[PDB]
Amino acid sequence: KNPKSDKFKVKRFHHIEFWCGDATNVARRFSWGLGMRFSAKSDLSTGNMVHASYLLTSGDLRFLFTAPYSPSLSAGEIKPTTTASIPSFDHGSCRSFFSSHGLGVRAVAIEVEDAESAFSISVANGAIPSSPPIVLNEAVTIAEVKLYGDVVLRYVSYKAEFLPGFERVEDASSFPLDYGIRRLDHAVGNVPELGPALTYVAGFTGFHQFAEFESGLNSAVLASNDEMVLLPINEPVHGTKRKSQIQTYLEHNEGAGLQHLALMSEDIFRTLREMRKRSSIGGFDFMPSPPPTYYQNLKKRVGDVLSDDQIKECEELGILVDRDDQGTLLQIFTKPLGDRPTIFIEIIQRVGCMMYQSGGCGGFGKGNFSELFKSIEEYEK
Amino acid sequence: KNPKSDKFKVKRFHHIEFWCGDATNVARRFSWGLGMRFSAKSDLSTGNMVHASYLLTSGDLRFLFTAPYSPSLSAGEIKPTTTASIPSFDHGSCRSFFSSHGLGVRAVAIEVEDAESAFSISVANGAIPSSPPIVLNEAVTIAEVKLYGDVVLRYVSYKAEFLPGFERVEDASSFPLDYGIRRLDHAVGNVPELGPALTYVAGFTGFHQFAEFESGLNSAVLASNDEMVLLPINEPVHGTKRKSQIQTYLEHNEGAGLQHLALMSEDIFRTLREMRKRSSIGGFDFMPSPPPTYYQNLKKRVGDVLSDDQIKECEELGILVDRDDQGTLLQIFTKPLGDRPTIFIEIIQRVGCMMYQSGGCGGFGKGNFSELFKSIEEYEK
Ligand SMILES: CCCCCn1ccc2c(C(=O)Nc3nnnn3C)ccnc21
Ligand SMILES: CCCCCn1ccc2c(C(=O)Nc3nnnn3C)ccnc21
Ligand SMILES: [Co+2]
Ligand SMILES: [Co+2]
C-alpha cells in the first residue's frame, strides 16, 4: 500500500556531498575506484575563497567532495559578499563534522519542484532547519533541514549546470571513466533509535514506509510518492552474540550518520569486474565473498532468473542475490570507504517490476542475512 | 668546501609522514599516482585505537600517511598504556595541524646512529624539543625536534620492520606498483625569513651550507656530512612584478612548512610516462610544459650529455634540465598534491659525480629560473 502522502513534490536524488579534509585526494581516489568522471569544480580557480568542491558524475549519479580552505582567505567576506558557491557551507561546521565523524556524507540532496516551499512545509511539519532557502543567480534554490546526526536533507529546485559558480572542468583533466554505475538507488542512515528517527523524517516529508518482503539490527525504509527516493534507516539490536555492526558504526562515527550509499549499475558484472581490477591499485575493496555453498543454493532460489553462467559470474565476483515477490536483487558491499568502519558503498542491479522499473524492485537484501548464515554452516560441511 | 660539522652521526632520509584527515584515501591516491606499494600498517586491525597509519614504499622511499581516530576509542588510555604505534602522535596536534595547513608533511625523518643522543645534542644546541626520545619494544628509538612551522625533524635509530607495532599488510592488498622512484633526494621548507631559519637548523644539526653553482625567492641548502641529507629552505622576495610563489604558499599554508619533496628516479623518463598516463585517472598533474624553444636551447647546454632522442624524450614529457660544474639535473614538478597551492612533488634524476654518486650532483635547478624566462620570450618570437 502506497498512500502517496508526500507533503511536497519530490523528483529524484540529485547529489551526495562528502565533507572532506582534502577534497582533491578523496575525489581522485573515488573517481578511479568507481569510474566517475570529473565534471565540475568550484575552488580557488573559480573565485571561491571559502571551500574547494569537486563534482564526480557517472550517469545520473553525482558525488560532490568539499573541504574548507583557510578561513584567512575569506576573512574579509560576509555572507552578503561571500565567494562560496554553496552558501550553506561553514568552515566551523565542516571542520567540526570531519573531526567528529571523519570522512562521510554531509548532505543527501534531492531535487524538488520548489526548494523554498519544501523547506517551509518541512519546518512547519517538525523539520529542524539547517540552512534557509537561498536563490543562486536567480536560477537555483537550495535549502537544508536536519536528517539525522550531522547529515542534512538538501532540497534543490531549478527554475529551468550543476550549481551557479561551478565551472565545467577542462577536457584534458576530464577522463571519461565509466564502469556502468548510473544512479543512486538508496541512502541509508544509522541511528541509536529507529522509532523516533522514522517519526521525525516521515513527519516532515510525508514519506511512507516501503513494504518489505537476530542479525543485530532493525530497519525500515521511507519512500517518496513514486518510491524513487528511498531512505532506509537502521537501529542496533543490543545483547546479540556478535556485536551489532550498527552499534560499532555509532561508536566509531561518534553517533548517527549515513551508513551506506547504494549505487545502481546498468551492468553489475562489468561494474564489479572493473572495480575489482582496481581494488589494490587505488580503488575500493569488497567484503569477503560468500562460500561456494551460497552459490550452490542460488540455483533453487533464482534458477529461473539467472542462467548457470550468470550464476557462475556472480560467484566469480562475490555478488549476492535476493528476491522479492516482485523482483530480484543483485548486490555487493564494499569495505569502508575510509579510515573508520563507518560509511561503505553497495553496488546493486534490480531485475523485474517493469511497467520503466518501479522503485525498490526486489527489496534491499533482507533475505541475505538468513541465507548467508544458512551458507556459513552449510559450507562448514 | 665541506667542513663536515654534523654534531651527531646522520645516515639517510628514513621516511616522510603526512598528517591527513583520512589516511586511507590519501594513501590510495598516492600509491596509484606515484607507483608506491602498500607495505605496512598500524590501525584498528593491529590494535591501534589512536591513529591510522599506512606506509607506502618505492625503493628506499617511505611515505607514511596518518590520521586520528575519534579520541573516544582511546579515552581510557594514558601514555604509559597507549595503543599508538607512534608515541609522539597527539589527536589535538594532528587535528590542529590539518585544520591549519590542510594536507601536508608533519615529519621529515632521518635515520641516525642514536636518536637519544641526536635529540640531546640538538636541544643542547638550540633545537626546540617536540617529542622526547622513546624506545619502542627495546628495538627502535624515536625523537622529534621542531624544524620549521609545524614540521618536525624526526630522529630514528635502530639497535639492529618499519616500526614496532606496524604489521606487514596482506599480499593481496599489496600490489607491486613501481614507476622507478627510488629515494628521497631533498625536502624543501618555505619560511618567512631565511636567515633565522638557517641559523636555527644549522645551529642544532651542524649541517653545512651546500655550495650552489628576481624570481621571487632566496634559498640555501643545508647538508649533512656526506651531503646525502639535503634540506633546502626558501624565503619570499617582496615587491616583485609577479607575486612571490613563496608568499602565496605562506598565506595558503598559514605560515611556514614543507614546500616540496624531491624524489629521485632511476629512470625519470619511465617515471614521467607512467605518472602522466595516470594524471587524469586518479594520479598527479604536472606543471605546464616549457615552450619548444626551451628544448631547442637544450642542444647548446647539454648536447654533450643527452642525445637528440633523449632530448626529444625530455620534450615529450615536459622535463627540465639544468647543469652544475659537476653534473646534470633532470627535473619536473607536479601541481600541488592537494586542495591548497602549497605542497608539491619534484621528480629528479642526476647524472655525473661518480666516485656511488655524490649528493646534490647537478644542483637543484637554479639555472632553470633564468632559462625558462629566456625561453618564455624567445618563444613569443
Ligand atoms: C555479510 C555480507 C551480507 C550482509 C547481509 N546484508 C543484506 C543486506 C545488507 C545491508 C543493506 O543494504 N541494508 C539496507 N539497504 N537499504 N535498506 N536496508 C535495511 C547492509 C549490511 N549487510 C546486509
Ligand atoms: C616554472 C617551472 C620551473 C620553475 C623554476 N625552478 C627551478 C627549480 C625550482 C624549485 C626547486 O626545486 N627549488 C629547490 N630545490 N632544492 N633547493 N631549492 C631551492 C621549486 C620551484 N620552481 C623551480
Ligand atoms: Co542497501
Ligand atoms: Co628541488
From Swiss-Prot, chains A, B:
Primary residence: cytoplasm
Cofactor: Fe cation
InterPro entries in the record: 4OHPhenylPyrv_dOase, 4OHPhenylPyrv_dOase_C, 4OHPhenylPyrv_dOase_N, Glyas_Bleomycin-R_OHBP_Dase, Glyas_Fos-R_dOase_dom, VOC
Entry's cofactor comment: Binds 1 Fe cation per subunit.
Pathways per UniProt: Amino-acid degradation; L-phenylalanine degradation; acetoacetate and fumarate from L-phenylalanine: step 3/6; Cofactor biosynthesis; prenylquinone biosynthesis
Catalytic activity: 3-(4-hydroxyphenyl)pyruvate + O2 = homogentisate + CO2
Gene Ontology CC entries for this record: cytoplasm
Keyword check for Metal-binding: yes
CDD domains: HPPD_C_like, HPPD_N_like
GO molecular function: 4-hydroxyphenylpyruvate dioxygenase activity; identical protein binding; iron ion binding
Keyword Cytoplasm: yes
GO process terms (BP): L-phenylalanine catabolic process; tyrosine catabolic process
Residues annotated for Fe cation binding in this entry: 186, 260, 346
Broad enzyme group: oxidoreductase
Purpose: Catalyzes the conversion of 4-hydroxyphenylpyruvic acid to homogentisic acid, one of the steps in tyrosine catabolism.
Subunit structure: Homodimer.
Entry similarity comment: Belongs to the 4HPPD family.
Name of the protein in question: 4-hydroxyphenylpyruvate dioxygenase
Native source organism of the sequence: Arabidopsis thaliana
